[PDB]
Design a protein around this motif. Structure first.
Motif, PDB file in Angstrom:
ATOM      1  N   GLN A  55       0.829  -1.227   0.000  1.00  0.00           N
ATOM      2  CA  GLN A  55       0.000   0.000   0.000  1.00  0.00           C
ATOM      3  C   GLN A  55       0.859   1.271   0.000  1.00  0.00           C
ATOM      4  O   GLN A  55       0.603   2.201  -0.776  1.00  0.00           O
ATOM      5  N   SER A  87       3.075  -1.798   7.911  1.00  0.00           N
ATOM      6  CA  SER A  87       2.962  -2.518   9.187  1.00  0.00           C
ATOM      7  C   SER A  87       3.667  -3.888   9.103  1.00  0.00           C
ATOM      8  O   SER A  87       3.318  -4.719   8.261  1.00  0.00           O
ATOM      9  N   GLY A  90       1.502  -6.858   9.773  1.00  0.00           N
ATOM     10  CA  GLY A  90       0.748  -7.011   8.543  1.00  0.00           C
ATOM     11  C   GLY A  90       1.481  -7.841   7.492  1.00  0.00           C
ATOM     12  O   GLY A  90       0.898  -8.742   6.911  1.00  0.00           O
ATOM     13  N   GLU A  93       1.309 -11.390   8.372  1.00  0.00           N
ATOM     14  CA  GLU A  93      -0.078 -11.870   8.160  1.00  0.00           C
ATOM     15  C   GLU A  93      -0.460 -11.886   6.661  1.00  0.00           C
ATOM     16  O   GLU A  93      -1.478 -12.479   6.281  1.00  0.00           O
ATOM     17  N   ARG A  95      -1.139  -9.053   5.204  1.00  0.00           N
ATOM     18  CA  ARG A  95      -1.830  -7.756   5.188  1.00  0.00           C
ATOM     19  C   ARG A  95      -0.834  -6.630   4.799  1.00  0.00           C
ATOM     20  O   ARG A  95      -0.279  -5.917   5.644  1.00  0.00           O
ATOM     21  N   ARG A  96      -0.597  -6.530   3.487  1.00  0.00           N
ATOM     22  CA  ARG A  96       0.351  -5.569   2.866  1.00  0.00           C
ATOM     23  C   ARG A  96      -0.222  -4.129   2.820  1.00  0.00           C
ATOM     24  O   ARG A  96       0.491  -3.173   2.483  1.00  0.00           O
ATOM     25  N   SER A  98      -4.300  -1.816   4.138  1.00  0.00           N
ATOM     26  CA  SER A  98      -5.605  -1.847   4.831  1.00  0.00           C
ATOM     27  C   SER A  98      -6.569  -2.832   4.138  1.00  0.00           C
ATOM     28  O   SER A  98      -6.389  -3.146   2.957  1.00  0.00           O
ATOM     29  N   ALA A  99      -7.595  -3.297   4.882  1.00  0.00           N
ATOM     30  CA  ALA A  99      -8.615  -4.244   4.370  1.00  0.00           C
ATOM     31  C   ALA A  99      -9.354  -3.658   3.158  1.00  0.00           C
ATOM     32  O   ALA A  99      -9.629  -4.372   2.185  1.00  0.00           O
TER      33      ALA A  99
END
Length: 109
Positions: A55, A87, A90, A93, A95-96, A98-99
């Motif tokens: 992101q 993050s 992230g 997880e 999670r590169r 935000s959702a």
């Protein structure tokens, strides 16, 4: 789920415990060779993710990825040039971003 508010200190306790659980980010090296941002951990662990993956850097120039700082939480990174944060937890997880970013800007995968 618990009927609680603020005193739970949940999210704050998480971030601190995540520093001692996994690692903190010490350094970052944008490798123009590989076309990736390599996140060097406090255990020398190189997290290898592309600008086009993340992101913070989705369409960002290599020069902006030379001038980099660590996150305000000390977990991941804060590219102050971009005013963006990658993050660390992230990254672990997947999670590169935000959702909303991952749902509305889907990666070619």
């Amino acid at each position: 789920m618990e009927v609680s508010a603020n005193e739970l200190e949940a999210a704050s306790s998480r971030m601190e415990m995540l520093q001692r659980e996994y690692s903190t980010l010490r350094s970052v090296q944008y490798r123009s060779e590989e076309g990736v941002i390599v996140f060097i951990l406090a255990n020398d662990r190189e997290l290898k993710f592309r600008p086009d993956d993340l992101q913070a850097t989705y369409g960002a120039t290599p020069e902006q990825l030379r001038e980099i700082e660590i996150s305000p939480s000390g977990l991941g990174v804060y590219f102050e040039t971009l005013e963006e944060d990658v993050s660390l937890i992230g990254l672990l997880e997947g999670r590169r971003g935000s959702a909303k970013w991952m749902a509305e800007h889907p990666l070619a995968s």
